[PDB]
Amino acid sequence: AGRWNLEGCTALVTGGSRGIGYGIVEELASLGASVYTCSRNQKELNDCLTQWRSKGFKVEASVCDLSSRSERQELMNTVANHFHGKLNILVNNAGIVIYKEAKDYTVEDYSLIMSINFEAAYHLSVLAHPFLKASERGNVVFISSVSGALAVPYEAVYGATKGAMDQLTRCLAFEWAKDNIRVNGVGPGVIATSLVEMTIQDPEQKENLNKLIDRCALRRMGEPKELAAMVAFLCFPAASYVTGQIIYVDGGLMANCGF
Amino acid sequence: AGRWNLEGCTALVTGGSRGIGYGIVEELASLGASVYTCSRNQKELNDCLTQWRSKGFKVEASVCDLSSRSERQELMNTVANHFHGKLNILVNNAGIVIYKEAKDYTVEDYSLIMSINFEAAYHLSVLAHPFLKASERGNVVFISSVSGALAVPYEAVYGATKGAMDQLTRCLAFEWAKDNIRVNGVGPGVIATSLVEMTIQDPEQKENLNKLIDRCALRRMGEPKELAAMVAFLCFPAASYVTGQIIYVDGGLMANCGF
Ligand SMILES: NC(=O)C1=CN([C@@H]2O[C@H](COP(=O)(O)OP(=O)(O)OC[C@H]3O[C@@H](n4cnc5c(N)ncnc54)[C@H](OP(=O)(O)O)[C@@H]3O)[C@@H](O)[C@H]2O)C=CC1
Ligand SMILES: NC(=O)C1=CN([C@@H]2O[C@H](COP(=O)(O)OP(=O)(O)OC[C@H]3O[C@@H](n4cnc5c(N)ncnc54)[C@H](OP(=O)(O)O)[C@@H]3O)[C@@H](O)[C@H]2O)C=CC1
Ligand SMILES: CN1[C@@H]2CC[C@H]1CC(=O)C2
Ligand SMILES: CN1[C@@H]2CC[C@H]1CC(=O)C2
Prior knowledge:
The structure is a homodimer. The first copy, chain A, is of the alpha/beta class. Chain A has helices spanning about 20-30, 40-50, 70-80, 105-135, 155-175, 195-200, 205-215, 225-235, and strands at about 10-15, 35-40, 60, 90, 140-145, 180-190, 245-250. Chains A and B meet through helix 4 and helix 5 of A and helix 4 and helix 5 of B. One 8-methyl-8-azabicyclo[3,2,1]octan-3-one binds near residues 146, 147, 152 and 199 of chain B. Chains A, B: One of its GO terms (molecular function) is tropinone reductase activity.
């Protein structure tokens, strides 16, 4: 792998069947990496593979429900064999949202969002650890959110899971430093995805969304690839001194207050 | 309650038999509030109740294991009955620490700490919400940790629970603002509690603690009364405009880097 590329590096991207995860598979696939992604739908993944492999991308995928502990274990074994026990990149992107007020959450909502958004990321990280070390140049990137540092409507529990993940990111950077593993987080602002799409279907969430874009310096939504570009850089051998950092690609929304 | 006192206010402080929590009961009550506390050791509570009552503090205590959804409800009912359905202050202080590296955490472990550290506080706040509202001047104060924002050894997961709490603190201040409730967090540094006394029994950890103390401006351990002091003020009517804050009572710990 070169200073500004991932030629040869292997990688696992959770939830790459849509949006940002998809933007990330393509970004790394295009920079030389061999990718392996997953989602809860085979037919969807297959349509993704058809598109990816048509551009010369070295990609492979398989159905997996990250909300299930036992499955995540199976996923790690398969990917491991696939990459011959050597994984350079782990992009913990899969995440879901449940728009409700704090007090309106059912044990079902809370347990689901926490297993998928945090548990799963924490869990996979640990499962991938021995392979990242053996790679001798591992990188773990967590996809956070601006919502894990600042309050947003209906995202209290969702931010709670992203705020947990960021502390995890920070601590792991220090525990795995000796294992050659750099650990970083990337907090997206508002990026145009299927998740954001289903969202604006609601007249309230749409009004709430335009508030966000207005509070931006760029005042527009990001593109799955503007986000993916930051994730890719963090994986190059060029980002060698960068670890334990949480970086936001929000078009300036984190720096705002009265604009 | 005057601008600088708590006379007439009612409050619940989880985990008041020892440490910071014991310290908080004494401070709020000393300031005229009517407290109710809990812990998993009845005999200890009884020694405390005898201590506090001896000096005239108005306080009640029941046994409850916060790691249990049912027991928590049980507690909210009594408390509410005890205080006639009006709760002014809720202080989510209970917490445990399990010093293992993120990858060495077992499920029982992750479940235990996540359950006590973040779940119960979240759950207890919601359950309390109705009487906090009825009181007409509700205050919720989550006891976080410096480890909730920065890497500390063996506290990767613990820190994740505080990072989740911290985000929830911010959001709740906004969701419950119209209910006339203020929500903040108080992140301790190194306070001399029984948890610490226990922690430094291990040589390696004794070394780790000293690392921190040498890392704070005031180069010393704070006292429970010193953490209680910051919690009693956010509850004072004098602190009416403070909401959504995470304040650190750490002797300078959070401002250091090269000292
Ligand atoms: N788009 C935005 O504006 C922002 C997104 N984010 C974060 O970015 C990440 C991606 O979100 P985004 O692209 O918007 O969302 P999308 O819904 O567009 O994509 C999420 C992807 O994750 C996959 N996924 C979800 N749950 C599982 C599961 N249990 N098992 C396997 N795959 C799963 C989905 O596949 P499937 O549904 O088929 O299972 C899908 O491919 C998340 O962590 C989100 O919190 C944060 C801030 C902003
Ligand atoms: N001491 C320090 O330096 C720091 C402490 N903190 C935070 O301060 C808070 C208190 O810590 P500290 O005073 O040091 O700890 P202590 O161990 O001294 O006291 C903790 C108290 O919480 C109670 N408790 C724990 N679990 C439960 C439970 N499941 N149900 C009911 N009560 C419970 C304990 O009682 P029992 O065991 O008998 O049930 C005890 O009375 C925590 O949130 C901790 O994370 C954060 C940073 C620094
Ligand atoms: C609506 N909401 C906005 C943008 C996408 C979605 C998740 C988030 O973190 C903030
Ligand atoms: C050692 N470690 C320090 C101080 C007490 C213990 C827990 C914590 O949160 C930070």
